[PDB]
């Protein structure tokens, strides 16, 4: 990545480096990567943590962090990828999913969301307050700068 | 044997949504999360 970009990863990394020793820890890794646009799964995050912990020390320096950020990095049109994933659950194929159904699948399949996590999703997704989620508009709003 | 088509698609797709939602709450400071100063 560009010098400007790496400076951006470094700025983020350094924000979570509590005492300026040039390391963060496994307890900050997910948050830093997310803050920079990554969406690791829970299993992926745990495996990156396991990599760090392989030597029984839980700290991560900047080159190690860049290595983990870059590894199998896969660019796409992210908003579209997410819209497509929602479309899988659009059972009547109409651009909408009910708030109840979205809550159900998000908490009963896969890396299930906690009640706190899904409560926020539904609060953000149903902007017309009508029990329905227009997922294209939801993803647009969540991707805005 | 394998999952059926829709069940496999749903498994793959819900995990994408979960991971994206967890990332989104950090980026947008939703649900109590705030970046360090």
UniProtKB/Swiss-Prot annotation, chain A:
The record's account of how the chain is modified after translation: Ubiquitination results in a strongly decreased activity. Phosphorylation results in a decreased activity.
Gene3D superfamilies, alphabetized: EF-hand
InterPro entries: CALM/Myosin/TropC-like, EF-hand-dom_pair, EF_Hand_1_Ca_BS, EF_hand_dom
Residues noted as binding Ca(2+) 3 in the record, renumbered to the chain: 90, 92, 94, 96, 101
Modified residues (N6-acetyllysine): 18, 91
Gene: CALM1
Covalent link (Glycyl lysine isopeptide (Lys-Gly) (interchain with G-Cter in SUMO2)) residue numbers: 18
Name the record gives this protein: Calmodulin-1
Organism: Homo sapiens
Residues the record lists as binding Ca(2+) 1: 17, 19, 21, 23, 28
Lineage summary: Eukaryota, Metazoa, Chordata, Craniata, Vertebrata
UniProtKB/Swiss-Prot annotation, chain B:
Coiled coil: none
Effect of residue 18 to A: Loss of calmodulin binding
Chain ranges of the IQ domain: 10-37
Localization annotation: Cytoplasm; Cell projection, Cilium, Flagellum; Cell projection, Cilium; Cytoplasm, Cytoskeleton
Disulphide bonds in the chain: none
Biological role: Component of the nexin-dynein regulatory complex (N-DRC), a key regulator of ciliary/flagellar motility which maintains the alignment and integrity of the distal axoneme and regulates microtubule sliding in motile axonemes. Binds calmodulin when cellular Ca(2+) levels are low and thereby contributes to the regulation of calcium and calmodulin-dependent protein kinase IV (CAMK4) activity; contributes to the regulation of CAMK4 signaling cascades. Required for normal axoneme assembly in sperm flagella, normal sperm tail formation and for male fertility.
Domain notes: The IQ domain mediates interaction with calmodulin when cellular Ca(2+) levels are low.
Family that this chain belongs to: Belongs to the DRC9 family.
Summary of subunit composition and partner proteins: Component of the nexin-dynein regulatory complex (N-DRC). Interacts (via IQ domain) with CALM when calcium levels are low. Does not interact with CALM in the presence of Ca(2+). Interacts with the HSP70 proteins HSPA1L and HSPA8. May form a complex with CAMK4 and HSP70.
Protein name, entry field: Dynein regulatory complex protein 9
Organism name: Homo sapiens
Gene (UniProt): IQCG
Region of the whole protein represented: 389 to 420 of 443
């Amino acid at each position: 990545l560009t010098e400007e970009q790496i400076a951006e990863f470094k700025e983020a990394f350094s924000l979570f480096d509590k005492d300026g020793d040039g390391t963060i820890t496994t307890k900050e890794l997910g948050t830093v990567m997310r803050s920079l646009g990554q969406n690791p799964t829970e299993a992926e995050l745990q495996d990156m943590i396991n990599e760090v912990d392989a030597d029984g020390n839980g700290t991560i320096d900047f080159p190690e962090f860049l290595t983990m950020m870059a590894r199998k990095m896969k660019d796409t049109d992210s908003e579209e990828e997410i819209r497509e994933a929602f479309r899988v659950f659009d059972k009547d194929g109409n651009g909408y999913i009910s708030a109840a159904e979205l809550r159900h699948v998000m908490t009963n399949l896969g890396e299930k969301l906690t009640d706190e996590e899904v409560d926020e999703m539904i609060r953000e997704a149903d902007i017309d307050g009508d029990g329905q989620v227009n997922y294209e508009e939801f993803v647009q709003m969540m991707t805005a700068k | 044997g394998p999952l059926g088509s829709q069940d496999l698609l749903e498994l793959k797709s819900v995990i994408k949504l979960q991971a994206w939602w967890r990332g989104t709450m950090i980026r947008r400071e939703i649900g109590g999360f705030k970046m360090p100063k």
